[PDB]
Amino acid sequence: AEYSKVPDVEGQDKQKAIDNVSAKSLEPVTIGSGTQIKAQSIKAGNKVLPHSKVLLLTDGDLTMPDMSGWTKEDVIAFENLTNIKVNLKGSGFVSHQSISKGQKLTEKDKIDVEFSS
Amino acid sequence: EYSKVPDVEGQDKQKAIDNVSAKSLEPVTIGSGTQIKAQSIKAGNKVLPHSKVLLLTDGDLTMPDMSGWTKEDVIAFENLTNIKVNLKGSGFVSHQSISKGQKLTEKDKIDVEFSS
């Protein structure tokens, strides 16, 4: 397998989903303070580059991840997964986010991220 | 109702266009060549019907018409061409700093702005 095939982890408890994504040589990133996975950012069965991120939305409250070092593709994945609009400033890797990691998000929220080399 | 992206890398440009359209997807070609060099989505992946598959041709890189594109489409263009795009706003593309058809080189930079 040159590409990693993304596993189906929707409906799994949070830690099981983390373990299952990591076992496919992918990087799981969880979003929210819940205990089960509600949605994943890449469709199960699709193939992606190894060690790329798979965003996992938990049930319960949506909370802000640490986007440090993310790519534009990672951030837009967050936008599409959560329906929270993000402004991307510049190019490169995320060097700043307007909402600190851990904060509960209300969908009335908006996010500004800055990229740098 | 997902569609499976076909493998059109290396195909004749028109054949690739026809093959992507036959999967209910929107092919968008980038460049003025006659053979496909790269596609923006991995062949075999399931995507929403009528979503765009960007197709880089050989020959010269040239600017597509991005009007109405989503941010995801524009980021796909940046990754496919290695031309940095600055994305201003959210929604659908309403302006691009380089007119459609113009030859591009990787020392070009593109500003794109969005609206609802």
Which 3-state string (H, E, C) describes chain B?
CCEECCCCCCCEHHHHHHHHHCCCCEEEEECCCCEEEEECCCCCCEECCCCEEEEEECCCEECCCCCCCCHHHHHHHHHHHCCCEEEECCCEEEEECCCCCCEECCCCCEEEEEEC
**Bridge partners for A63 per DSSP:** A104
**Bridge partners for B85 per DSSP:** B110
Q: What is the resolution of this structure in A?
A: 1.8
How many alpha carbons lie under 13 Å from residue A2 in its C-beta half-sphere? Answer: 1
**Is residue A11 classed as helix, strand or coil in its secondary structure?**
coil
CA–CA distance, A89 with A82 (Å, rounded to integer): 19
Helix (H) or strand (E) holding A80, with range, is helix A72-82
The pair of structure tokens assigned to B68 is 């109405």
The pair of structure tokens assigned to A82 is 């959560």
Q: Are B38 and B9 in contact (CB under 8 A)?
A: yes
Q: How many contacts (CB atoms, under 8 Å) link A and B? A: 36
Number of structural domains, chain B? 1
CA–CA distance, A115 with A13 (Å, rounded to integer): 33
CA–CA distance, A15 with A28 (Å, rounded to integer): 10
DSSP code at position A42? S
CA–CA distance, A32 with B22 (Å, rounded to integer): 39
What residues contact residue A94 under an 8 Å CB cut-off, 6+ apart?
A67, A68, A69, A70, A71, A74, A75, A113, A114, A115
Q: What is the experimental method? A: X-ray
What residues contact residue A22 under an 8 Å CB cut-off, 6+ apart?
A28
Mutating which of A87, A98, A117 best tests the B interface, going by the most B Cβ atoms within 10 A? A87
DSSP code at position A32? S
**Is residue A2 classed as helix, strand or coil in its secondary structure?**
coil
Chain B contact residues (CB < 8 Å to A): 2, 42, 44-46, 71-72, 75, 78-79, 84-90
The pair of structure tokens assigned to A58 is 């938990």
CA–CA distance, B35 with B16 (Å, rounded to integer): 8
Q: Which of B45, B79, B84 sits opposite A46 (nearest CB)?
A: B45
Q: Residue A85's domain spans which residues? A: 4-117
**Is residue A71 classed as helix, strand or coil in its secondary structure?**
coil
How many residues in chain A?
Answer: 117
CA–CA distance, A75 with A115 (Å, rounded to integer): 11
**Is residue A113 classed as helix, strand or coil in its secondary structure?**
strand
B87: nearest CA partner in chain A = A88
Degrees to nearest 5, angle at CA A70 with A64 and A73 = 100
Parallel/antiparallel/unpaired status of strands B110-115 and B85-88: parallel
